[PDB]
Scaffold this active site. Structure first.
Site, short mmCIF file in Angstrom:
data_model
loop_
_atom_site.label_atom_id
_atom_site.label_comp_id
_atom_site.label_asym_id
_atom_site.label_seq_id
_atom_site.Cartn_x
_atom_site.Cartn_y
_atom_site.Cartn_z
CB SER A 73 -3.68 6.86 4.99
OG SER A 73 -4.19 7.55 3.86
N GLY A 105 -8.22 10.30 6.87
CA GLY A 105 -7.50 11.32 6.13
C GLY A 105 -6.07 11.52 6.54
CG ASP A 140 -2.08 1.02 1.04
OD1 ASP A 140 -2.32 1.48 -0.10
OD2 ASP A 140 -2.71 1.37 2.06
#
Ligand SMILES: COc1ccc2nc(C)c(O[C@@H]3C[C@H]4C(=O)N[C@]5(C(=O)NS(=O)(=O)C6(C)CC6)C[C@H]5/C=C\CCCCC[C@H](NC(=O)OC5(C)CCCC5)C(=O)N4C3)nc2c1
Ligand SMILES: [Zn+2]
EC number: 3.4.22.-
Length: 199
Positions: free
Chosen positions: A158, A156, A100
């Site tokens: 990350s 919000g 990710d």
């Protein structure tokens, strides 16, 4: 059809989390209208400063953190998107969907965090609202919040940093461990994983 196929815009830096003084606070450097325009053109001539940037696409907003001269963020926010820069869109130099994780060359004017070598488990998470959340490391990629908070508090953030007491980068905030909507722990990309990706 082919002639009408759209192009996804670039990620755009719209602000920063100021950590240069004794008070942490969020700053906005570009509004929504200018962000939309900049995402389409990929040309961003605004001055960049600091280590933690607030970034946005047309549909999402999150954080990005400079470590070792690379601006890192999460794939689930940025996808394969370019980042807007003074000379046009810049292609990602790192992309790892399994982690990710994505990364671009750090913008001129930004400052980079140093990868932590302390081996310490007393950490601090920096959110998009400039909150500094104490976190106890519980594993290679996990840490517990000393004071749990609703996941709304972390949404919000990350791409933001987990730091050691000395301000070194320990990881990149990736996901919240939630039970009944309360975040009791966080999942992060360890800085060592970034370093392996860099090699
Ligand atoms: C599409 O390709 C990929 C590739 C790899 C990948 N790997 C992932 C781990 C992955 O997770 C997904 C995205 C991530 C996420 O929301 N993170 C942020 C965030 O702020 N986002 S953001 O800035 O708002 C945004 C949305 C970019 C604009 C930090 C958290 C704040 C609040 C939590 C809200 C509730 C979601 C809880 C989820 N909890 C969770 O899955 O916990 C597990 C089960 C996994 C580990 C611990 C236990 C969660 O946190 N989630 C789901 N998606 C991907 C997608
Ligand atoms: Zn350290």
């Amino acid at each position: 059809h082919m002639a009408s196929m759209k192009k996804k815009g670039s990620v755009v830096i719209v602000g920063r989390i100021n950590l240069s003084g004794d008070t942490a606070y969020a700053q906005q450097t570009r509004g929504e209208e200018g962000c939309q325009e900049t995402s389409q053109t990929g040309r961003d001539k605004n001055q960049v400063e600091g280590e933690v940037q607030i970034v946005s696409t047309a549909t999402q907003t999150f954080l990005a953190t400079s470590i070792n001269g690379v601006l890192w963020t999460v794939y689930h926010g940025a996808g394969t998107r370019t980042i807007a820069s003074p000379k046009g869109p810049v292609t990602q130099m790192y992309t790892n969907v399994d982690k990710d994780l994505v990364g671009w060359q750090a913008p001129q004017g930004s400052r980079s965090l140093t990868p932590c070598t302390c081996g310490s488990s007393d950490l601090y998470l920096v959110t998009r609202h400039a909150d500094v959340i104490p976190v106890r490391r519980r594993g290679d990629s996990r840490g517990s919040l000393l004071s749990p908070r609703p996941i709304s508090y972390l949404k919000g953030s990350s791409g933001g940093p987990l730091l050691c007491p000395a301000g070194h980068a320990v990881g990149i905030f990736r996901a919240a461990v939630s039970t009944r909507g309360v975040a009791k722990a966080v999942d992060f990309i360890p800085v060592e994983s970034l370093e392996t990706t860099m090699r």
